């Protein structure tokens, strides 16, 4: 899953606060 | 616009290590990806590893783990690498660098602000 | 650990020629998370191209980047004097990081 991938937490964290 | 501004040159015994500061003028930093690279006289570039600042959450590639340390402060947007057990293969330019941001704010993993570099001789 | 392959080592070309340079990775980019960086002498590398195919804003028109899979290619449609520099490919699809070796643009003679 690229959810444990480091190169897509910040990503993440940009879609979840949005 | 942003710029990141690195710490003086530094020369080190081998066996010593070495602290090297980055610090960002102004810009998202807390949940942005900021790198480090480094490049040895002649050679080409070399990921060493990141951190996330918000999370503290660094991460480092297998061949400095036990040797490297990336650190962050978020109230003054600064990076702090660390680099132990210096050997004479150390010795490089090493650079500081922020993820691109896109479209909306979207991060875009590729580094997009760079430091100037900070040169490191590991010399006796 | 994702090997990035460069190609050629060193580009011999002339001002106002054609560049292709290439990047080949040792495993399937799947969401094209690849860059290309350039390096003049004594400066820090500069963004080109991220995502594969998406030049950096600020950046000259000339450059575009192709390609998907495990082949990637950087395109500098007519070389200007300040383009003979060193060019690096990069993925982060995957940790860690990796940079190819890096590839040289120098002047034909």
């Known amino acids: 899953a690229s959810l444990w991938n480091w190169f897509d937490i910040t990503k993440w964290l940009w879609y979840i606060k949005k | 616009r942003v710029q990141l501004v690195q710490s003086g040159a530094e020369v080190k015994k081998p066996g010593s290590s070495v602290r090297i500061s980055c610090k960002a003028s102004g810009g998202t930093f807390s949940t942005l990806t900021l790198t480090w690279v480094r490049q040895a006289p002649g050679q080409g570039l070399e990921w060493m590893g990141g951190?996330?600042?918000?999370?503290?959450?660094?991460n480092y590639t297998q061949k400095f783990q036990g040797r490297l340390t990336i650190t962050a402060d978020t109230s003054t947007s600064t990076s702090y690498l660390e680099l132990s057990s210096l050997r004479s293969e150390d010795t490089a330019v090493y650079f500081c660098?922020?993820?691109?941001?896109?479209?909306?704010?979207?991060?875009?993993?590729?580094?997009?602000?760079w430091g100037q570099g900070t040169m490191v001789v590991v010399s006796s | 650990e994702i090997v990035l392959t460069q190609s050629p080592d060193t580009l011999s070309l002339s001002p106002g020629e054609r560049a292709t340079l290439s990047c080949r990775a040792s495993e399937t980019i799947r969401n094209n998370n690849l860059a290309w960086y350039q390096q003049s002498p004594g400066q820090a590398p500069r963004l080109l191209v991220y995502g594969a195919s998406s030049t950096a804003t600020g950046v000259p028109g000339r450059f575009s980047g192709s390609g998907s899979g495990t082949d990637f290619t950087l395109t500098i449609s007519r070389l200007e004097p300040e383009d003979f520099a060193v060019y690096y490919c990069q993925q982060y699809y995957k940790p860690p990081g990796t940079f190819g070796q890096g590839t040289k643009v120098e002047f034909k003679r």
């Open positions: 660098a922020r993820e691109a941001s896109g479209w909306f704010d979207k991060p875009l993993g590729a580094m997009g602000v």
């Open positions: 951190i996330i600042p918000l999370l503290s959450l660094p």
